[PDB]
Amino acid sequence: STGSATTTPIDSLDDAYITPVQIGTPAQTLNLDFDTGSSDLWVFSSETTASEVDGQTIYTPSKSTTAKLLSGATWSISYGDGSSSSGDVYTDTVSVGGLTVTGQAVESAKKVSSSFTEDSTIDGLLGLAFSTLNTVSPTQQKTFFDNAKASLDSPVFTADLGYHAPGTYNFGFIDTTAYTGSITYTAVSTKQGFWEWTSTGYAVGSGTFKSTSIDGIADTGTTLLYLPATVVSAYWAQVSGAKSSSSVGGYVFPCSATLPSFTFGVGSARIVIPGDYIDFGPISTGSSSCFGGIQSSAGIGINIFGDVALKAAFVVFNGATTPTLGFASK
């Protein structure tokens, strides 16, 4: 089997992407944030504290003839951005782009943090990291991909995120029309439960490539590119007037600037992030200070190849017995 679904930016900045997901019988379609940096499929629901729901579409398990309470199971998650959610668990039928999993753990939120409430466009998350990170207790549950894997034509999914435009998540096949040149594959460590890999270096604009190992994670659920302070400083030094602002929470730059591109290495190959992808717009409405899309990972504890990086590529998440990651230009 295979599946193919369009993923759409939630706003004009590509702050996140939503993908429609069918849950239950009859189908209830929710727009979920596919997150290769976590491993829980959780949804706003009829059980979510009413004051914490503001415009989201909810899953109502009592209206699904295939929903079953997973007795005794609870979940609770905290994300790198400080947001969180928790609740109980059902199993139900879940379909993405024509690919169906029966008995998928659907984690129903009883509580969500303010950042989730305030984002009316995201109805929940669909985790695509390794199932070892799943938070369901006392019986850990498998991701949608892990459940689908054996049935897929090939044990892979691909992320093809758009810049200010829709893109595609495919399951079970590689669309050879969706990228240019060849896909370069690179090793993955699953030791921390992430799609963790080592970039071979970087360049700023038309500058020379610096060969240096950068360990990080391919994370569709993180907006920006978080890299070591040395790398980030080298980038922003090429933008007149750019500076790190403790009050704002990262590098800012004059909105009048033209940003240089940023290249990262994948083996001997190179992915070029155009300068415009690095612009996240005014820090507040009407400001002439703009927020940068490349930020320091210092104090995150891990480098994160988030959407800013991934949307410059066609990315293969290869879930073979020994997982690997593939990147192509597009």
UniProtKB/Swiss-Prot annotation:
Reactions listed under catalytic activity: Hydrolysis of proteins with specificity similar to that of pepsin A, prefers hydrophobic residues at P1 and P1', but does not cleave 14-Ala-|-Leu-15 in the B chain of insulin or Z-Glu-Tyr. Clots milk
Highest rank taxon of the organism: Eukaryota
EC number: 3.4.23.22
Keywords of the record: Aspartyl protease, Disulfide bond, Hydrolase, Protease, Signal, Zymogen
List of catalytic residues: D35, S199
Disulphide bridges, residue numbers: C255-C290
GO MF entries: aspartic-type endopeptidase activity
Occurrences of domain Peptidase A1 (ranges): 17-328
Gene Ontology annotations of biological process type: proteolysis
Family: Belongs to the peptidase A1 family.
Record protein name field: Endothiapepsin
Range within the parent protein: 90 to 419 of 419
